[PDB]
Design a protein around this nucleic acid. Structure first.
Ligand SMILES: [Mg+2]
Ligand SMILES: [Mg+2]
Ligand SMILES: [Mg+2]
Ligand SMILES: [Mg+2]
Ligand SMILES: [Mg+2]
Ligand SMILES: [Mg+2]
Ligand SMILES: [Mg+2]
Ligand SMILES: [Mg+2]
Ligand SMILES: [Mg+2]
Ligand SMILES: [Mg+2]
Ligand SMILES: [Mg+2]
Ligand SMILES: [Mg+2]
Ligand SMILES: [Mg+2]
Ligand SMILES: [Mg+2]
Ligand SMILES: [Mg+2]
Ligand SMILES: [Mg+2]
Ligand SMILES: [Mg+2]
Ligand SMILES: [Mg+2]
Ligand SMILES: [Mg+2]
Lengths: 49, 175, 60, 52, 126
RNA sequence: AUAUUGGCGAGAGACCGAUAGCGAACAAGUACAGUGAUGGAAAGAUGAAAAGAACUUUGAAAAGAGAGUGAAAAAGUACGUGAAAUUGUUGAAAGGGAAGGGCAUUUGAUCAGACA
RNA sequence: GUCGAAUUUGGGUAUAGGGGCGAAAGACUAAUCGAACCAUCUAGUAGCUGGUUCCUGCCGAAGUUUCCCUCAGGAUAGCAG
RNA sequence: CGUGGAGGUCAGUGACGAAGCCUAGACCGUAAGGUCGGGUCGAACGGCCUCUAGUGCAGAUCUUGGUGGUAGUAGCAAAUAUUCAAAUGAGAACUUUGAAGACUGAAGUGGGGAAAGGUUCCACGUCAACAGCAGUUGGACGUGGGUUAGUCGAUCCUAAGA
């Protein structure tokens, strides 16, 4: 039991370093966001204030 | 194992280390530099005074836009702080080093900090949500700290024939 | 220096030290040519390797 | 494979977007989104002059 | 050199076959030669090793040791002999995994099926 | 006799070698995104063998220091090798509003050849 | 500003892209509308911009001529081998 | 001059250490480059004659990954507000009880539902990560318990419609 517990603790280390809320936290960020990197702003209506 | 520097004659030295410590790398670097080279008990008392805000840690490298204090004058600086988390981690490692030296049988009154090193651990990567739907990094900078304490303890000349003759003439002239 | 018997960054690994010992024995040969559990278990292995009458014909 | 590097849904984001004009993978929710695509200089893209 | 078109010399295929072979194939893969005396007595060279026969270690650090087969761990392609172990100070004893091609059978565990196997391989027992 | 980028069974290569090669060498059309049609990743290597570090000691603990296993821990489930950017310590040096480079020599450090 | 009605609102239901719906602003039609979103044909099309990876040796140019009416795009002469 | 792979050869190199990598050391080339020593490392690899190509990078707002300076900086200032003792604990501004001070002020910071979610409800254990300070606490982590209908709904009816 203690050996398997130590194995699980050693396994946890990289997800803990990535600051996951647990096993179930698998949120994926996109590399680039088009709404943030698609700007060519004329004289008129913009996409944000 | 595998410190940055070791002690020749390890029978008169003791070492301690702490890895992946979630404490500020920059503050801890300044704390370890404030400790470097001191006698061990003197360093421990100094760190207790620092926690008590009677003395201060000088900040020499990572100190852009820090406030100024009168407790820096003892070290000839104006920028000094009182980093509690760094001081407590370093005090823990100092107590461990003293324990190891006692287990080895070293004389505690003669021990001085002969090596102390702070390295950057792998970062802790949180993220924050910011305006216009952005994700920005929000990271912790942890430290590896290692230290060694040590007991403090206490001609052929080739001449030309001209030079040789000059020396022989000088000796003949002299008594 | 260790065979002859401050702070330094010169250390010798045990892998390299064993290789130096082996290679020195090679050179020396050329120059010439030119457990409590075990004991307890074995001890146990070595060790293992008219009459009388009470009562009588009556019901007590 | 003559389909290598082409089984991807990607389009350029246009000129004046402060990023390079290489076509980029659409959609969202995964690290592949927004990445460069199709090019012989792109990771996972088609090699120049594929062998036949 | 191979002559059949049904046999493959491909390394990748041979290794996949070895590492995914099932238990009945692993029995044949874990064969062991017989000793000189047993070889002369039975007239055969090697047999698939089984659980109750006695072996001699002829290779490795445990060479020269004898014992009875304790188990045939086919999942890890190894056998364990009762007298061939590694010991710790806290009393722990871990069996050594030995490959049967590095062993030698000194006494066979005979039954009806084993006798039939020897006789159909050309053995001449008794 | 002809066709055959689907299915089943085989044999091969002057092919690729984990950013390559199919999107996928791994619980990959997975995880994840989208109301939906659809979009769609990352991710291989301790060791011959888990022998994966008993025991003592410091610490609330993670851990450390001894000890031990192992050929090796300069292999410790962050695990073969372990580059560069960037960083710490130590040693040497330079610095009156940049540094770097060329020719030449002083100084300090350091070094090979040739030694009958 | 309006606040008892051309009022506000849940749910169900109908209308779908060279279409709908519009007390009409080219509004709105899932952060998308001078043309929704998704896949494919498709590596669509270049007058233009950017880039295009080892060494050394020897040789080494070109705005100066005719034309397709002239722009554009081409042909021809010259110069370098 | 250099690189991946192919035919031939040196009965070539290699666990007395192949390849790779680091190097205040040595040498040869005008140069592309080549060669030797030391350290590290652990299983393969070269010279020559030829064959062949997905064969040499500083740039492309190049692609993917990694990392700096900025910097212990900007900042963590809406929603009136906190304080005392004890307990628990390695550790308490933030946990629990009590003692107090305030607030929502019935168009509520109260008591229930519909849509949506799906166990978040509740107990025991318990702190690596998460709760932009903290944490002994938690809607977190680990193991379980819990939703009982002839009368409440669905189910039946028809609506615009399909
Ligand atoms: Mg400021
Ligand atoms: Mg938002
Ligand atoms: Mg590809
Ligand atoms: Mg791939
Ligand atoms: Mg490594
Ligand atoms: Mg570097
Ligand atoms: Mg080598
Ligand atoms: Mg190319
Ligand atoms: Mg580059
Ligand atoms: Mg260039
Ligand atoms: Mg760039
Ligand atoms: Mg980048
Ligand atoms: Mg501030
Ligand atoms: Mg407030
Ligand atoms: Mg009030
Ligand atoms: Mg009020
Ligand atoms: Mg609850
Ligand atoms: Mg926090
Ligand atoms: Mg729970």
């Amino acid at each position: 039991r203690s050996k398997a517990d130590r194995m699980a603790k050693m396994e946890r280390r990289e997800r803990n370093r990535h600051a996951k809320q647990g096993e179930s936290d698998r949120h994926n960020a996109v590399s680039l966001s088009k709404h943030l990197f698609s700007g060519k702003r004329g004289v008129g209506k913009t996409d944000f204030r | 194992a595998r410190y940055g520097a070791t002690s020749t004659n390890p029978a008169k030295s003791a070492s301690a280390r702490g890895s992946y410590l979630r404490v500020s790398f920059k503050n801890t670097r300044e704390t370890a530099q404030a400790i470097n080279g001191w006698e061990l008990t003197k360093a421990q008392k100094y760190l207790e005074q620092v926690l008590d805000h009677q003395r201060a840690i000088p900040f020499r490298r990572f100190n852009s836009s820090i406030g100024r204090t009168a407790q820096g004058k003892e070290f000839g600086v104006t920028k000094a702080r009182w980093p509690a988390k760094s001081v407590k981690f370093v005090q823990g490692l100092l107590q461990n080093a003293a324990a190891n030296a006692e287990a080895k049988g070293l004389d505690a009154t003669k021990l001085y900090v002969s090596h102390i090193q702070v390295n950057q651990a792998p970062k802790q990567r949180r993220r924050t949500y910011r305006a216009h739907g952005r994700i920005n990094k929000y990271e912790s900078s942890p430290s590896h700290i290692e230290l060694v304490v040590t007991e403090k303890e206490e001609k052929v000349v080739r001449l030309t024939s001209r030079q040789r003759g000059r020396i022989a003439a000088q000796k003949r002239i002299a008594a | 220096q260790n065979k002859k018997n401050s702070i330094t960054t010169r250390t010798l690994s045990k892998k390299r030290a064993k290789k130096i010992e082996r290679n020195l024995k090679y050179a020396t040969q050329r120059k010439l040519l030119v457990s409590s559990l075990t004991l307890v278990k074995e001890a146990l292995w070595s060790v293992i390797d008219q009459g009388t009458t009470l009562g009588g014909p009556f019901f007590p | 494979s003559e389909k290598a590097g082409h089984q991807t849904s990607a389009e350029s984001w246009g000129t004046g977007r402060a990023v390079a004009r290489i076509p980029r993978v659409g959609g969202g929710g995964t690290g592949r989104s927004g990445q460069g695509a199709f090019g012989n200089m792109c990771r996972g893209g088609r090699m120049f002059a594929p062998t036949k | 050199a191979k002559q059949s078109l049904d046999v493959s010399s491909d390394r990748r295929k041979a290794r996949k076959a070895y590492f995914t072979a099932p238990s009945s194939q692993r029995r044949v893969l874990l064969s062991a030669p017989l000793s000189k005396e047993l070889r002369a007595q039975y007239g055969i060279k090697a047999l698939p090793i089984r659980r109750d026969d006695e072996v001699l270690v002829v290779r490795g650090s445990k060479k020269g040791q004898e014992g009875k087969i304790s188990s045939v761990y086919r999942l890890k392609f190894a056998v364990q002999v009762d007298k061939v172990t590694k010991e710790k100070v806290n009393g722990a004893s871990v069996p050594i995994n030995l490959h049967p091609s590095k062993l030698v059978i000194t006494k066979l565990h005979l039954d009806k099926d084993r006798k039939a196997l020897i006789q159909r391989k050309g053995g001449k027992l008794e």
